[PDB]
Amino acid sequence: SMTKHIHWDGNLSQEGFEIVKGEGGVIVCPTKVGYIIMTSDKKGLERKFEAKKRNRNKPGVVLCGSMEELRALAQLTPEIDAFYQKHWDEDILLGCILPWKAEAYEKLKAYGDGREELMTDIRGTSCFVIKFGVAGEQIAKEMWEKEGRMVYASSANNRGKVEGIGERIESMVDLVIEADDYVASIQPDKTIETRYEQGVMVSMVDKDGKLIPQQGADSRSVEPCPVVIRKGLDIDKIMMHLSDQFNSWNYRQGEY
After folding, report:
1. Which of 12, 182, 214, 231 is a Cys-bridge partner for 138, taking CB atoms 3.0 to 4.6 Å apart?
2. What is the CATH number of the domain that holds 175?
């Protein structure tokens, strides 16, 4: 009920790491567009859904700390792989809905705690995200490289401010990391009414959850194809990259 608050200094949070590494750990953490709740197991995921009162059919997302973790876990084509690399190189926040590699999904289930219920959907897909904010990027990278563990997330209710997360969430969590100034510096040209509050999402799967086909630089009008389903931070740079990499794609705001 009482909760410890600390200020992020730009280096890896050792306190935040040790908490999420521990069984059932749950923290709040700053991102480029606001605040997220972060956990790494089924016990922590239950706490998250309860605290937000979130629909159980709406899964948490997978936070990637490197391109190596992404390629170990998700099915890819050479175009999709190349699409992500450019976002990595240029440091742009990006999320894509992909299927799991068969062997990765077996390992996933090996944990035995039944976490697949809360971070994949019924078709077996997840949203894999990169370059979402340094503070959380540092923690996800340590967990992966030094413990072989994954980290999962959902948004912390907020207008970009830590006092916006609300009383319920704040008392049910083990630690809150603050950095209001970091969040504000990301969009200095905007106001509270005009700033983006979420990141872009792109579907890379057809309606059954199967990977979209390879197009080819010389093809036209190929379907099924990539689909933008949520508008967000840097949408202008992302559509420019879509049109450089695919001759065929769709824009469908509000389909998630």
Report:
1. 12
2. 3.90.870.10
